[PDB]
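#help-structures

NK: newbie question. if I give both the sequence and a SMILES, will the prediction place the ligand too? trying with chloride ion
OV: yes, paste both and it writes out the complex. here, I ran yours:
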Amino acid sequence: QMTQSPSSLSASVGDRVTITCRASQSVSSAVAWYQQKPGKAPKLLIYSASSLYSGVPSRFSGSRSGTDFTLTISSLQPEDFATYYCQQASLTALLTFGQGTKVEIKRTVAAPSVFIFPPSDSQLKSGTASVVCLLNNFYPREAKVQWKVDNALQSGNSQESVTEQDSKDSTYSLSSTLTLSKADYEKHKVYACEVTHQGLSSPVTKSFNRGEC
Amino acid sequence: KIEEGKLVIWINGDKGYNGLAEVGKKFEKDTGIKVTVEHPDKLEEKFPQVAATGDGPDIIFWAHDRFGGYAQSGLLAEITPDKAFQDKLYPFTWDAVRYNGKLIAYPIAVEALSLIYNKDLLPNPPKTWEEIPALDKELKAKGKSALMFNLQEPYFTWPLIAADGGYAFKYENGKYDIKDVGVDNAGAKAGLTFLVDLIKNKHMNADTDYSIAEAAFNKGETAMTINGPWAWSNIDTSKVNYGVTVLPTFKGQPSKPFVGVLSAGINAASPNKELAKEFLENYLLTDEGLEAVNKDKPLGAVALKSYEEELAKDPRIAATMENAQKGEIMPNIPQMSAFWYAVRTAVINAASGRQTVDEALKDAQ
Amino acid sequence: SEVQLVESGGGLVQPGGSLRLSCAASGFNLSSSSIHWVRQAPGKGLEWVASIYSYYGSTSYADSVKGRFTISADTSKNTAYLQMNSLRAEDTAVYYCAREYHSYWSYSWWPRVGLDYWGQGTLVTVSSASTKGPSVFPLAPSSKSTSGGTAALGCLVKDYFPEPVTVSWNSGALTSGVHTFPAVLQSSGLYSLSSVVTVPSSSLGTQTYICNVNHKPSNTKVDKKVEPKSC
Ligand SMILES: OC[C@H]1O[C@H](O[C@H]2[C@H](O)[C@@H](O)[C@@H](O)O[C@@H]2CO)[C@H](O)[C@@H](O)[C@@H]1O
Ligand SMILES: [Cl-]
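OV: that's the protein plus ligand as structure tokens.
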């Protein structure tokens, strides 16, 4: 087991960046670091804990401190925003990858604009109802969406996905879909989605009433 | 002829032979079979001489590099661990004891040299060999010295010789070319020259051996030494506040220590092969057997998988395995004893000044 | 002569089925290197699968594939293989092959170093779903949209298989403020995604917003006009 931390970190061009993996019940120093961009294969950075792979720029370096292995980027460059993976080869000849670390572009905290969408009539025509909550252009990425049906908490009946960091304003957008059968959708009246974000002083709630207008 | 109904074991005098004898007393308690542990001088040279005539110990312990020569001469029994037992040790340690496709010994532990430093005299040990002369000049003003280690055995100087390019035998396309020896190339010459300059400028003494360097470090007279895990227990007794860390780099490249696998071979002449197998598999290569030897003198990174959790609690072992990560497992081919004898003569002749570096390494070639 | 690895054999397979991947190497002798298979489930991290790791041809596997996958190699063809049997939904992923080599290795392949060359990856989908085109529904702008500001609308593309779908707006003319979200795999085995866009609230009654959905696997092309709901 290779515990990688943090799962995501925000930084600016010129920053010194540090990523650490902790090895458990292991004495191997066969520790490598990889960089991966969206849609591409991983690329080797460091091997043997501290050896710089040929052709990799000098700002990348590895070190070991006890059971903790760290990748350092001395001066973050624009092409260095990506995901990084640590990897150990155990003395038992097993490979383990860390969970990964997203290095993303830091910017000013920005609260989301929240919208809620009722299921269309053409969908209800088929027996299922999807309720969509939109969080537009926020930062940072951490956000909490809570669905409430007649002020009752929901769990296990919603899925969400997030976009990549926007190429110009460096923000995120999130979409959450509340899925219910047409029978259960018409048993209730008030449908709300509650958003908790650092840019919001208090949770914002967007709601509608079933079949009003 | 070897006496039937008991075990005689040879192991080097720097290892935990008293702890190993405690495992033999447990074997004697359970089975009634007496185990006698001996540590004769130059046992890696004595064993091939007495074993060839059908004498010697039942079991011989040494690093894996000498066993290929013993196997070629027919002096070792092929060992017979089943698949379940082989799955109890790390695969790379089994690779170290394969010769001509066959297992010729039981792997015990992985050994590598580390830099050992006195934290009170030197809280930030140097990262490069190149900065040691200035450090010594500073410490000599205070009646101390920077570094002392064994200059009589090439094992201790090999990490520096190999750093910039020196090697033993060339390996190419799945085999060694035993006529292609790398003891006198540019990389080897650079490393040995740096050692000789340390001696010419009186930062080290050509006469320093194992005992002298050990005494000097354990009394706080020198700030660093180079040694393996077996030496840590005597440092614990001296109460020096020591640390274990990575060997220094040379010309920007890591030191490349040879990695040894302490291994146990069974004398082909032994009439106690079944007893020897039972002792090694079910008494030594257990958590409690390795613990008993380790309490006497640390073995390093023991080959038994079930012990890795305990090893990980010992930060000296992580340092040992970081130096091993930057090194190479020794060949075990029969030509290794000739390689070692040649490097030993070249280092001694160059360090003493009776020959230049070029003359000594040319004679080793 | 460049080192490279090329995976093939990916595709769609039913749960319980079998699939054999191939990894063709060039620019180096595969027999002197270690060869590893590593997979990456959609949106997830790297997961090591199997290796040939020693001079003697020893293999190792991750626990999640042990007994079901077999790694092998044909030295005469400089190719490695991953035979995958009893496949499950959780085995869906991009499968990468990667080599590990150290020039000082001998009969001992020590120390273990980095995976320096990877292939582009081949995609394996394990599912019992049939090809199905999506039903596109409007996400009508709210009737209480902040005036003098910005309103949100979109279309919901639901219940299709397999990936992918592409979504545009006004035939590519409207690109500013568009977010097409990554698809989600529903418990039914079908995918679903949304594509939204923000527009001025004063243009809801004067401008036309049409989302164009394309699902090539089923040859479905929908245009869906989105507009406020009538009461
Ligand atoms: O110096 C030549 C010598 O090196 C190695 O011996 C080591 C041994 O591996 C260690 O366990 C420890 O006892 O120190 C020895 C050096 O004095 C090789 O194993 C040996 O064959 C070789 O002659
Ligand atoms: Cl998120």
